[PDB]
Amino acid sequence: HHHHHHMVHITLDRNTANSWLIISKDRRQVRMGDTHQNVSDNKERFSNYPMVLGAQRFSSGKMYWEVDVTQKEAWDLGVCRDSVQRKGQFSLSPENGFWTIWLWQDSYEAGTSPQTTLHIQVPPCQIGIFVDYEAGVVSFYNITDHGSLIYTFSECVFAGPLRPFFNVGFNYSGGNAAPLKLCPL
Numbered sequence: 001h002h003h004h005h006h007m008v009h010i011t012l013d014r015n016t017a018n019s020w021l022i023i024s025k026d027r028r029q030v031r032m033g034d035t036h037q038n039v040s041d042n043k044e045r046f047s048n049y050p051m052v053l054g055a056q057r058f059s060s061g062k063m064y065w066e067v068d069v070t071q072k073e074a075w076d077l078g079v080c081r082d083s084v085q086r087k088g089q090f091s092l093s094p095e096n097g098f099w100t101i102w103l104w105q106d107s108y109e110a111g112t113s114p115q116t117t118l119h120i121q122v123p124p125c126q127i128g129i130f131v132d133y134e135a136g137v138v139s140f141y142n143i144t145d146h147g148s149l150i151y152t153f154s155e156c157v158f159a160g161p162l163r164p165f166f167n168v169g170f171n172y173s174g175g176n177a178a179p180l181k182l183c184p185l
């Protein structure tokens, strides 16, 4: 891909984070804490899952960013509508305002309804996310494997401003403590 030149500087929005997340001072890394992080609750925070949004809102143009997933067993990445549900149980699907992929139990899947099996030969340590708002496209790239395509959502019906979307995953196993990191340009 030649999407690198639409690079955007993403930062995490603390106010949207699940109350167990620890976001770095620079707002570029997030990990699961082993306890509640001593913040007040609010209607914006994701309650059920270890999710957080980027601060940036996109309503036009082409945007690209990269995320480091090194040594994680579970995570979700992509974009979502600014108005997605925050509280209670929900599935990650376009119908609910999400355009995501994930790793779970040694398989990679795209968040379609129902979910789509991904075919990844080289387990990624860094993922590139490309959004073309006008074209209705969200694409995922394997930066570890020379930028190879992972998945394209096309004919997307965004129906609102978009925000970068992250899930660090639970750490029941003790093998998923590592952070998600936004990679430098």
Ligand SMILES: COc1ccc2sc(N)nc2c1
Pocket (backbone or CB within 6 Å): 070, 071, 177, 178, 179
């Ligand atoms: C790549 O794995 C990492 C990186 C940073 C940290 S801080 C912590 N408690 N666990 C980890 C694991």
